[PDB]
Structure 1
Amino acid sequence: GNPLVYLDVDANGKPLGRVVLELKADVVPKTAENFRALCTGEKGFGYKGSTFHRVIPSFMCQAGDFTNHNGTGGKSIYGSRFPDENFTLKHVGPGVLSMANAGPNTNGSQFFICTIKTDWLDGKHVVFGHVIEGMDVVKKIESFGSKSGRTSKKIVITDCGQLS
């Protein structure tokens, strides 16, 4: 079946809890596999210890830059970037998991979790899963963002991996 993965998240060094994500490998296998392996760290790099560096209330929480920790970096398990697999899944509401990018076919490791429907990203960002459990953690993260995206607490993925 589709992978279930987890992110355990701290804010200012204290645990907020766990976000569980379903990865829609049935729709976007290459994109799901990238995220799954970055969660386990099995290629020798991944999300463990990295941050939510850009968080905008009433929009989304972005993370996954495990190389530069600021939005300029990250890399996929395939190489630095990989193509947009498809745009079939849509940004339908809070809890959608989608790939950040800097234009067509620039997926790396950065991702975002929506806290609202973000329909204008349909056809531009590859949606590849959604929150199964832990929206409360997502709302805490969101509450530490700002209009500019700068966070007001240090939000760290302390642990991550695959549940199934």
Structure 2
Amino acid sequence: GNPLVYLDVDANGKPLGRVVLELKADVVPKTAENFRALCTGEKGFGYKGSTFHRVIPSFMCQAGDFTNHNGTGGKSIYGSRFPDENFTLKHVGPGVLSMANAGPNTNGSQFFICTIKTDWLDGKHVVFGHVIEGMDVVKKIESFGSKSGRTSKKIVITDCGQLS
């Protein structure tokens, strides 16, 4: 079936717990596979040790820039960027997992977890999974954001990987 992956997240060096994500490989196999492999680190790079660098309360928590840690970087397992696979899944509510980008066909490694329905992103960002467990952890992360996106605690993915 579809992969289950995990992110273990610290805030200011103390653990918040685990976010478990289902990746919809049946709908977006290429996008799911990229995220899966970046969680395991099996290509020699990935999310371990990187941060949630942009967090906006009542919107979303963004992460995945494991090269520049600020929203300018990241890379996929395929190359620096890869196309928008499809827009079939929608930003339906809290817990949606979707690709951040810098315009059409600029997916790399950055991603976000929504904390509300974000319908205006439908057709612009590729949705590829959702939170199975750990929305409490997501709400903690969200609470350390701000309107500007600047975080008030350092939010680190200490460990990540594949459960099934």
Give TM-score, length-normalised by structure 2.
1.00
Q: Distance in 1 between matches of 2:101 and 2:88?
A: 17
For structure 2, the 5+ residue unaligned runs are none
Number of residues paired by the alignment?
A: 164
Q: CA deviation at 1:71?
A: 0.3
1:126-153: CA deviations, max 9, x gaps?
0000000000000000000000000000
Q: Distance in 2 between matches of 1:78 and 1:35?
A: 11
1:38-94: CA deviations, max 9, x gaps?
000000000000000000000000000000000000000000000000000000000
| Partner-residue secondary structure (3-state), 1:130 | strand
| Partner-residue secondary structure (3-state), 1:33 | helix
| Partner-residue secondary structure (3-state), 1:26 | coil
| Partner-residue secondary structure (3-state), 1:139 | helix
Q: Distance in 1 between matches of 2:73 and 2:22?
A: 24
| Partner-residue secondary structure (3-state), 2:48 | coil
For structure 1, the 5+ residue unaligned runs are none
Q: CA deviation at 1:24?
A: 0.1
1:90-120: CA deviations, max 9, x gaps?
0000000000000000000000000000000
Q: Distance in 1 between matches of 2:101 and 2:150?
A: 18
Matched, 1:109 2:105: no
1:132 is aligned to 132
Identity percentage of aligned residues = 100
CA-based RMSD: 0.1
| Partner-residue secondary structure (3-state), 1:39 | helix
Q: CA deviation at 1:28?
A: 0.0
| Partner-residue secondary structure (3-state), 2:151 | coil
Q: Distance in 1 between matches of 2:130 and 2:10?
A: 20
Give TM-score, length-normalised by structure 1.
1.00
1:10-49: CA deviations, max 9, x gaps?
0000000000000000000000000000000000000000
